[PDB]
Design a binder for this molecule. Sequence first.
Ligand SMILES: COc1ccc(Nc2nc(-c3cccc(C(=O)Nc4ccc(C(=O)O)cc4)c3)cn3ccnc23)cc1OC
Ligand SMILES: [Cl-]
Ligand SMILES: [Cl-]
Ligand SMILES: [Cl-]
Ligand SMILES: [Cl-]
Ligand SMILES: [Cl-]
Length: 268
Amino acid sequence: VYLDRKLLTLEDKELGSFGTVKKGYYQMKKVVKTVAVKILKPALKDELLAEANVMQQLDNPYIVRMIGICEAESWMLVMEMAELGPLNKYLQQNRHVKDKNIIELVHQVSMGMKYLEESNFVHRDLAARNVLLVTQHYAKISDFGLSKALRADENYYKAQTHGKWPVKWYAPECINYYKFSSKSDVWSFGVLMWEAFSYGQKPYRGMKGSEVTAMLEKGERMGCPAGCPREMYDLMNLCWTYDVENRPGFAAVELRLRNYYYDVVNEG
Ligand SMILES: COc1ccc(Nc2nc(-c3cccc(C(=O)Nc4ccc(C(=O)O)cc4)c3)cn3ccnc23)cc1OC
Ligand SMILES: [Cl-]
Ligand SMILES: [Cl-]
Ligand SMILES: [Cl-]
Ligand SMILES: [Cl-]
Ligand SMILES: [Cl-]
């Protein structure tokens, strides 16, 4: 959890800019581990410790692993590096990634989210930008800064202060009632699917969050990305069921993705 600054080596170049993120290496006794280190500039510190507390409890092949936290020139969260980075950016720069490969990756995210659902955690920022690639065929979920462990007696988290929120990824019940459940995450996952099959295009382009709400309330949903297979667009639309009760969970979604992926595999 608490790491030795002497064992961390940071590169100058930032990968991104809350703070910055930088690549580094962390020494074990016989190897070094390549790391991504989130580096802050009270509120920020509190959020980092909270995020670390959530990551600490998670153990799944499709979730980014925390190495630990470090308190030196600034506060640092140190994670196992996913070398290829955010999926949205990857797909923008790699437009000939095959449909079978996109299905493989979004299924992996679904398996990560099924685990998160079973663990009774809500992610609350599930977007393509927060899916990180280890390889072209291996995705992990990251960014647990808004994530919450559900109370033992509640199936949702009730936000109080509408913070700075990724509205275009949020279900109607999140915007209208400030209620966040694993089924809200399923909604976000449908948006993440749309982004993936759109090769990292932004959702609801040109629209204000307000117009998104109006659109969704009309019953309108985003169109099928070019080359996106029927079966996958149907699954997006099922993720975007307006009524939480009738919206599937991740067990349901993962299985549908699983079965389809095996069909696509069997073709060939
Ligand atoms: C430059 O390419 C990258 C390659 C690997 C990574 N890897 C990793 N990055 C992060 C990380 C943390 C905090 C913030 C960010 C971040 O700034 N992401 C991001 C996502 C999307 C965009 C964009 O759409 O332009 C720009 C930046 C990324 C965490 N991680 C945990 C394990 N591996 C990583 C990041 C890269 O750029 C942001
Ligand atoms: Cl250093
Ligand atoms: Cl060494
Ligand atoms: Cl909040
Ligand atoms: Cl947004
Ligand atoms: Cl599999």
